[PDB]
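Build the 3D complex.
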Amino acid sequence: VIRLTPEELRGVARQYNVESSNVTELIARLDQMSHTLQGIWEGASSEAFIQQYQELRPSFEKMAVLLNEVGQQLHNSATILEDTDQQIASQI
Amino acid sequence: LTPEELRGVARQYNVESSNVTELIARLDQMSHTLQGIWEGASSEAFIQQYQELRPSFEKMAVLLNEVGQQLHNSATILEDTDQQIASQIR
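Done.
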């Protein structure tokens, strides 16, 4: 089992915030790709993609919120852990 | 609109498709790591949200790949149809 450290937690917090950014960047790119697709195909092939895409998009925004909330709580926990460790270390 | 245009758009869709798969794989590992860091109801609620959203990500990667394949398909059809037409007229 791992004896956890504040740097481990901050490392993982940064991954969560990075992946949140990757999600919204991806959605932005797919939003524009949808417009491109609308111009290069006829209406029905385009309408087939858009309806499914727009059904899934809100779950990507939910993922981005989740990953940032996790990132934030991991940073909070890392500060708590550093403090806990320092309290113990100082005591004498 | 040219087969070249279509192929360029096709690969954008294929790139994003694999970006989504690759993201899911990173988040899967991260979720595992997170289970080792925390316990208690707040962490359980976070993990249950990730599990609830994950299926949407798998579906998106499938959707994007299909579009990419179809754009590739279109490009070829147009290229070959145009070549055949050029031939006819000559």
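The radius of gyration of chain B is 21 Å.
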